[PDB]
Design a protein around this ligand. Structure first.
Ligand SMILES: *Cc1cc2c(cc1C)nc1c(=O)[nH]c(=O)nc-1n2C[C@H](O)[C@H](O)[C@H](O)COP(=O)(O)OP(=O)(O)OC[C@H]1O[C@@H](n2cnc3c(N)ncnc32)[C@H](O)[C@@H]1O
Ligand SMILES: *Cc1cc2c(cc1C)nc1c(=O)[nH]c(=O)nc-1n2C[C@H](O)[C@H](O)[C@H](O)COP(=O)(O)OP(=O)(O)OC[C@H]1O[C@@H](n2cnc3c(N)ncnc32)[C@H](O)[C@@H]1O
Ligand code: HEM
Ligand code: HEM
Ligand code: HEM
Ligand code: HEM
Ligand SMILES: CCCCCCCCCCCCO[C@@H]1O[C@H](CO)[C@@H](O[C@H]2O[C@H](CO)[C@@H](O)[C@H](O)[C@H]2O)[C@H](O)[C@H]1O
Ligand SMILES: CCCCCCCCCCCCO[C@@H]1O[C@H](CO)[C@@H](O[C@H]2O[C@H](CO)[C@@H](O)[C@H](O)[C@H]2O)[C@H](O)[C@H]1O
Ligand SMILES: O=C(O)/C=C/C(=O)O
Ligand code: SF4
Ligand code: F3S
Ligand code: FES
Ligand SMILES: [Ca+2]
Lengths: 239, 655, 254, 254, 55
């Protein structure tokens, strides 16, 4: 508040032949409840309309604004400048994703491919009649499926993962969590063996080095640590 | 030239667009879904209240059916909706919930036992029998007597959107994000596709299809204060308008929400899950009981918004750098029991408002929330432009009239996706189109030239201040309370704003990944949408649903029992052309009367309403005497259409 | 090679058209060898620090160490077989765990930069695991071979001879911190990796495990750092050029 | 880290927007360290086989080895510094060349199957390079550390003591074939890799180089296999329990 | 139905087809070359006699 903030932003246009990666600094006056969302829009409308970034809900619910904020993958719309003592904030695009420009990366299409790779949809032999009563489900089970279904595909756990940064084909924490989400859903008939055919290799669960950065950075606080281990124990004893 | 072809083109990756894509793709029609952003980030993902559907599972849902849901919808619409469309909706909602359940949506379920509170007064303990255990639960939302709002804990829109998007991936629907439809290709009154701009590369591409469906959401962002995502700017509405043939319906019908966080607009679902939130003014005074002695804070959200504005104009509002607001106090709770999930709102306030709800009060002010208005279609979802369909908030299918029922909009998105999806598929499979390269090239090169002129423009106007000026005008003059004098001035300034938008100049000259270029062509579009809303509001001299004219406080069923149709025939005109579509009282199952909320006897009665009412009363009493069921009586009062796939009845607990 | 081996290489799948179970088995054995070595080093620290309980006690454990009842004499040949086994697991573990190293410039630069930007504990501790593991390729091999070829030189004075006289203290000093950091962090990660104790509150469990790790490791380095001084002291005392410290002889050598 | 380092990690390019020159430098140093060690081992085989020219001669080279004029006495401290240097290059080489190992199940299975189907000399010889290189992680480290910490134990009888008495012959026997196969094949590949002698008829050159390799290696193993027997013989002769073979003392120890 | 559009469709990836594709593509016409096999394996690749031209 009244405090002068130093915002350092990574800039680079891979589609421009004359663009070189560099940092650009901006000087903005802090205001109460100020978020990175507000900071970037101020810069856009009054200092530099060139800068690329992606915002949608600005309510921490859509997973669009992930970026490296002072070294940590976080949702820019829920990040308060107030929490940075130095008054110096450095913004980098999320690593491990294809860069579009500056702070904008292609997060959506990687997740879509991931969703297809683990076949992120209900697998059932028969199609239930939608004009009849729903199949009953224990409220406890519906609750635990929901917990894992809360993933907003923000990509923070992917960018946070040193393994994924070194090894591109790694399915990532988000992928391992998606598998478990269906594993514990009674509507899905796949067996442990079916899941093994999906992530039972070095690009899957066995490629995880348990760095746990995914768990410690998940803005949704999903139980990644225990859920991934759960999956590892399960996959290691398939055949 | 670059051309992409598909049998069914869907513009918009929200619940409506994705569900429609499933309908077409499942029948072998090649389909493409275009979206500004990855589809799972659409505004639909923000829905936390729930979805309305008459399942009749829980104790508080007992005895619920299509008729009761239909009544709430019609009366809520303040008789501005197409009642037949509402029937198609309520009858199909139950099956939408159930289909999503089969698709994995983790709906909160009912468990045997007793629950406390969650009631205005009197009773306070609810008992769920054993035969209800395991079925889809429901909560109190939207103010309906019967609790029928289904939910997946606190992220209903999110789980629903993800399931429908996953189904699209399963079927191999072609999802192309960061792609924007900037114009519709049409000839001889027929739509053959859209001209698309690749937001990343800047390429202008023609997407041709036998049928095109627009499910682009609302246009809340023309207002400064809104709960809508940053992408709900109404460009889908605009490109439809710019064809000079497709028409927009009831653009002036905008709904506000009483308690979004001020000034962010972030939704605080406070006072929902468990009634307790208390509204206070600048003196800490609980004012709602002063205006609504009986209902108090639990009055109709429609009423709460008005009272909040009234109280502020009475000089009892809180001053701040961003304007005036009021207070929302939930600390009066800050604790309870357990046995289920109940903890979220605090985080919203801490992460953004920077405070603990259980301690300090949250600043709030009514803000734009939903867009009843949209592209005008028939009951099948087809616009006046043949081959162009629309579904969801982007449409004016019109099951909402002048006031959407809480929980009905996320429900319409999926339901319309199912129904319009069927008609859209049928159209795409049966129609035959003549794709002329001469016409394709005209539209494509026309947009390329347009992009070039924007980048080369030596104009001195600043696109951002013009867009911000527009949002202020809309908020100040086209809000909860409106009057001719101010609407007159806003329309005038908007028109002036529109002319200046054409003299904009931008700094960044590149054609690819250019945020500034994006605003340069989107703002003029938003201004045309704003003009339709403002002008529609000025010419509508009556008060109906969410549209309140202080100079015409009554609902006029004699001169305004109709729908506003906006068009833009001459690409050079600066004001929309408005026409009216009258609502036939004889084609109504429920004649106009008291809407059920707000002041009593506040509407000019139409002689025909009384005539039709008597006929209804008569037709019912008779058939009821002959021992005819509600299904036969409904059909005798107002028959409606439904595609084969969904004309089955909905089984309920205890049939 | 075998036909099944050729079919899997060329098809990327098994003759039954399924993914190989080898990656799962390799993951299992990597952890199994790591666990063994981890526990082993714990006991090793106790028996090696017995010198603190007096030359007599250390002499006792040594003699009674690995088959002593079958032959009261000695038979240090058992220590060699024991050292051989441990060496084998040491190699197998190194072989398997080696797959996890950053393997090229990009992976290295890229991971290092991430580590420094993140300032995330468990990620940094993995770097240490990798670094300490690489160093032990050279450090551990030395100690393991000697221990396998000269088991009759283990004792209060014999060990102290090699420690000081033969200049093994530099290696031991470095290897101490190396294997300790490596083993304790590895045991911790192994717990969260397989979630053996997750229970109902995995977050509290992890917090506890991290606290335990620091305590256990703090205790081990200090103890091993004291045991270090022990042998070093006795080694600096050894002066008589006529005394055969290395092969000092009691009943069955020393 | 540094800003340039961050920009390169995130952009995959240099601040000047060019690809890093690091991969080129790393390739250079990998070969440079390999070359050094390769030549070094050649000389090493000569001086180590001097024992065949008589205990006197071997004693001569040893004493006159590394600074002897500055101090006629001895100063084995130089052998330690020399061993330290060689150890450093040994580690650097291992670090760099390690990047070339198959690193996972797929690469391993896949490459092994290819090797067996191909029956191609130079491809198979690379496997041996990799295999022998991995083994030397443990074998070479032992010899190098001892040689750096006990330089005063090098001599006709002192070395023979460690060879037989301390049981180093098993390691030396295995390490002999290991480093020889590794070094000769590596020197050969190094020649064709950089093409220093390609000339006008590279195919004839390569054929010659392959012939030379086999001859040079045949000569080295036989010589080193004879030198092996040399130290082993003198070691089996050592019996007097009153003789301090290890630290045998001439003027300046032994 | 699956449909691909281009301004100039060339059927055949031999010397004639590829050279014609160059002519159209160099003037901004989107062009597709269809071929049974990778174009560099077309029969044109077997010519060993030579090409006639009055230089
Ligand atoms: C804002 C809001 C709304 C809301 C709610 C909470 C909030 C914060 N809670 C609700 C609730 O509890 N119950 C309910 O019934 N409704 C609730 N709502 C409103 C409701 O969520 C919406 O009406 C509904 O989700 C709308 O769905 P729809 O499918 O129509 O649209 P969408 O999700 O907004 O997605 C629009 C898509 O269109 C793409 N787009 C837009 N313009 C273009 C152009 N020009 N070109 C290409 N694509 C375009 C967007 O990218 C998006 O995918
Ligand atoms: C056979 C031959 C011809 C020849 C020659 C030596 C041999 C062995 N030496 C010549 C020489 O020295 N001087 C000379 O002037 N001519 C010589 N010739 C004949 C000459 O090479 C040919 O006439 C010439 O190369 C023909 O070129 P063209 O571009 O016309 O055709 P092409 O190279 O055969 O390629 C045909 C392509 O068509 C594709 N294809 C065919 N059918 C289809 C269908 N149905 N759909 C899609 N693609 C199709 C083929 O795949 C190929 O790419
Ligand atoms: C030759 C030297 C060694 C090398 C090359 C080495 C290397 C490694 C590496 C890089 C890892 C990480 C594996 C991963 O992330 O999946 C690891 C883990 C581990 N190591 Fe070692 N190691 C060596 C010696 C030892 C020794 C002597 C011990 C005994 C203290 C040991 C105990 C462990 C443990 C407990 C793990 C955990 C294994 C797992 O996570 O599955 N290591 N080692
Ligand atoms: C095969 C079983 C092993 C035996 C028989 C053994 C035995 C011993 C003995 C007797 C000592 C005392 C000093 C001396 O004799 O020189 C010692 C010290 C030491 N050993 Fe081992 N060891 C074994 C395996 C290992 C392994 C696998 C490592 C690590 C890779 C290791 C690391 C050390 C260290 C660092 C010390 C120093 C103790 C201190 O200063 O606290 N040992 N060992
Ligand atoms: C710590 C043990 C060692 C390891 C891990 C090792 C590993 C390797 C490997 C895997 C290669 C193949 C590199 C490639 O294909 O690019 C290589 C090449 C080579 N090594 Fe070693 N090495 C070791 C010790 C030695 C020693 C002692 C010598 C001396 C005889 C030596 C001399 C060479 C030579 C001449 C090359 C050729 C380098 C090149 O092609 O650039 N290495 N080594
Ligand atoms: C730092 C320089 C080196 C010195 C001072 C040195 C010295 C010696 C000496 C004196 C011997 C005779 C026996 C003994 O003393 O135990 C010997 C044998 C041996 N050294 Fe080294 N060495 C060095 C480096 C290496 C390296 C780098 C390797 C391989 C990685 C190696 C491999 C061998 C082998 C295999 C023998 C056996 C000779 C035979 O039996 O033919 N040495 N070394
Ligand atoms: C911590 C243990 C490491 C595990 C071993 C396996 C991974 C590392 C080796 C394989 C990858 C090769 O890694 C490459 O090594 C050279 C070292 O000469 C590094 O070189 C860089 O760091 C070294 C060390 O701080 C500096 O002296 C050097 O000036 C600098 O340019 C490269 O940036 C790195 O990318
Ligand atoms: C020759 C030197 C090797 C260089 C070292 C780096 C590459 C090799 C290690 C990394 C890849 C891991 O490689 C993996 O190892 C295990 C050994 O337990 C092999 O396992 C297979 O071969 C071994 C050895 O013949 C058999 O005892 C075993 O029954 C068989 O299943 C896997 O098929 C291989 O894919
Ligand atoms: O009050 C809410 O959270 C949502 C309301 C909606 O249905 O629009
Ligand atoms: S698991 Fe967590 S961090 Fe990873 S994508 Fe989902 S919500 Fe984001
Ligand atoms: S950070 Fe990566 S290594 Fe595994 S524990 Fe999480 S996915
Ligand atoms: S903008 Fe949606 S989570 Fe940040
Ligand atoms: Ca609408």
């Amino acid at each position: 508040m009244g405090r002068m903030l130093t915002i350092r932003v990574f800039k680079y246009d891979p589609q421009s032949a004359v663009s070189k990666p560099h940092f650009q600094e901006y000087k903005i006056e802090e205001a109460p409840s100020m978020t990175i969302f507000i900071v970037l829009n101020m810069i856009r409308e009054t200092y530099d309309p060139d800068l690329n970034f992606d915002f949608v809900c600005r309510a921490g619910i859509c997973g669009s604004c992930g970026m490296m904020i002072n070294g940590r993958p976080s949702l820019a719309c829920r990040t308060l400048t107030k929490d940075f003592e130095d008054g110096v904030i450095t913004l980098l695009p999320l690593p491990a994703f294809k860069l579009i420009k500056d702070l904008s990366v292609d997060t959506g299409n990687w997740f879509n491919g991931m969703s297809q790779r683990v076949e992120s949809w209900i697998h059932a032999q028969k199609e239930h009649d939608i004009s009849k009563l729903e199949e009953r489900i224990e409220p406890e089970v519906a609750q635990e499926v929901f917990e894992l279904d809360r993933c907003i595909e923000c990509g923070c756990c992917i960018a946070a993962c040193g393994t994924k940064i070194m090894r591109e084909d790694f399915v990532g924490a988000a992928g391992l969590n998606r598998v478990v989400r269906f594993m514990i859903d009674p509507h899905d008939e796949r067996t442990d063996e079916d899941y093994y055919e999906l992530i039972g290799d070095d690009d899957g669960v066995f490629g995880c080095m348990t760095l746990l950065a995914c768990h410690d950075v998940c803005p949704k606080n999903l139980p990644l640590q225990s859920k991934i281990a759960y999956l590892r124990r399960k996959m290691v004893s398939v055949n | 030239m670059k051309v992409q072809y598909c049998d069914s083109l869907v513009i918009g990756g929200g619940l409506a667009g994705l569900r429609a894509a499933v309908a077409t793709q499942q029948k072998g029609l090649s389909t493409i879904v275009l979206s500004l952003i990855p589809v799972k980030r659409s505004h639909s993902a923000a829905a936390q209240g729930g979805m309305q559907a008459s399942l009749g599972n829980s104790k508080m849902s007992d005895g619920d059916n299509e008729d009761l849901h239909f009544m709430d919808t019609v009366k809520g619409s303040d008789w501005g909706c197409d009642q037949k469309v509402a029937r198609m909706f309520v009858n199909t909602a139950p099956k939408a919930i159930r289909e999503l359940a089969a698709w994995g949506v983790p709906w909160t379920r009912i468990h045997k036992g007793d629950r406390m509170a969650i009631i205005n007064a009197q009773k306070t303990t609810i008992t769920e029998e054993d035969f209800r255990h395991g079925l889809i639960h429901s909560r109190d939302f939207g103010g309906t007597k019967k609790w029928r709002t289904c939910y997946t804990a606190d992220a209903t829109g999110h789980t629903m959107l993800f399931a429908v998007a996953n189904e699209c991936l399963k079927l191999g629907v072609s999802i192309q994000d960061r792609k924007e439809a900037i114009a519709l290709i049409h000839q001889d009154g027929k739509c053959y596709g859209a001209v698309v701009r690749d937001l990343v590369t800047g390429d202008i591409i023609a997407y041709v299809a036998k049928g095109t469906l627009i499910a682009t959401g609302g246009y809340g962002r023309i207002y400064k204060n809104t709960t809508n995502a940053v992408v709900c700017e109404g460009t889908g509405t605009a490109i439809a308008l710019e064809t000079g043939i497709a028409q927009l319906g009831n653009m002036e019908a905008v709904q506000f929400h009483p308690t979004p966080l001020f000034p962010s607009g972030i939704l605080l679902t406070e006072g929902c899950r468990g009634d307790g939130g208390i509204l206070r003014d600048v003196d800490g005074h609980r004012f709602m009981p002063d205006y609504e002695p009986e209902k108090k804070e639990l009055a109709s959200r429609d009423v709460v918004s008005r009272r909040m504005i009234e109280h502020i104009r009475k000089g009892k509002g809180v001053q701040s750098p961003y304007g005036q607001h009021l207070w929302l106090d939930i600390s009066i709770l800050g604790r309870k029991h357990i046995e289920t999930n109940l903890r979220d709102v605090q985080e919203i306030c801490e992460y953004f408002a920077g405070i603990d709800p259980a301690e300090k009060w949250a600043p709030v002010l009514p803000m734009q929330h939903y867009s009843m208005g949209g592209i005008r279609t028939d009951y099948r979802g087809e616009a006046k432009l043949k081959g162009l369909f629309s579904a969801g908030e982007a449409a004016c299918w019109d099951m909402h009239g002048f006031n959407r029922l809480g929980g009905n909009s996320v429900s319409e998105a999926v339901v319309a996706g199912m129904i319009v999806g069927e008609y859209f598929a049928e159209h795409c499979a049966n129609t035959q189109v003549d794709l002329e390269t001469k016409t394709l090239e005209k539209f494509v090169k026309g947009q390329e030239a347009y992009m070039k002129s924007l980048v080369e423009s030596k104009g001195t106007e600043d696109v951002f201040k013009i867009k911000n000026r527009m949002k202020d005008v809309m908020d100040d003059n086209v809000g909860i309370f409106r009057d001719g004098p101010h609407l007159e001035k806003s329309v005038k300034e908007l028109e002036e704003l529109y002319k200046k938008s054409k003299n904009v100049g931008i700094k960044n000259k590149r054609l690819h990944a250019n945020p500034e270029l994006e605003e340069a062509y989107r703002v003029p579009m938003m201004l045309k949408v704003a003009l339709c809303v403002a002008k529609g509001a000025l010419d509508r001299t009556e008060s109906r649903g969410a549209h309140n004219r202080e100079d015409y406080p009554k609902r006029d069923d004699i001169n305004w029992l109709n729908r506003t149709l906006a068009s833009w025939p001459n690409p050079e005109q600066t004001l929309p052309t408005l026409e009216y579509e009258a609502l036939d009282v004889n084609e109504m199952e429920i004649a106009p009367r008291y809407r059920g909320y707000g002041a009593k006897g506040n509407y000019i009665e139409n002689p025909l309403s009384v005539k039709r009412q008597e006929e209804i009363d008569k037709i019912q009493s008779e058939l009821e005497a002959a021992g005819k069921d509600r299904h036969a009586i409904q059909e005798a009062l107002m028959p409606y259409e439904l595609p084969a796939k969904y004309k089955a009845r909905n089984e309920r607990l205890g049939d | 090679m075998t036909n099944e081996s050729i079919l899997e290489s060329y098809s990327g799948v098994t003759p039954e058209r399924k993914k190989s179970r080898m990656p799962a088995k390799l993951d299992w054995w990597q952890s199994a060898t790591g666990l063994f070595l981890g526990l082993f080093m714990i006991g090793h620290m106790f028996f090696v620090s017995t010198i603190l309980l007096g030359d007599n006690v250390m002499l006792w454990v040594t003699k009674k160490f690995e088959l002593d009842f079958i032959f009261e004499g000695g038979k240090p040949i058992v220590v060699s077989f024991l050292a051989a086994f441990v060496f084998a697991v040491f190699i197998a573990h190194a072989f398997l765990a080696m797959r996890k190293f950053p393997i090229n410039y990009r992976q290295y630069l890229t991971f290092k930069t991430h580590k420094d930007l993140m300032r995330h504990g468990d990620t940094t501790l993995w770097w240490i695991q990798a670094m300490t593991g690489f160093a032990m390729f050279f450090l551990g091999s030395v100690h393991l071979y000697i221990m396998m070829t000269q088991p009759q030189t283990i004792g209060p004075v014999s060990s102290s001879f090699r420690m000081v006289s033969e200049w093994m203290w530099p290696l031991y000093l470095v290897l101490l911190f190396a294997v300790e950091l490596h083993g304790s962090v590895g045991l911790y990660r192994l717990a969260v990796k397989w979630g053996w104790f997750d229970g109902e509150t995995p977050d509290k469990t992890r917090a506890n495990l991290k606290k335990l790790k620091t305590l256990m490791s703090a205790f081990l380095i200090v103890l091993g750092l004291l045991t270090f001084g022990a042998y070093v002291k006795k080694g600096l005392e050894q002066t008589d050029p006529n005394i055969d410290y290395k092969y000092f002889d009691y009943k069955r050598t020393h």
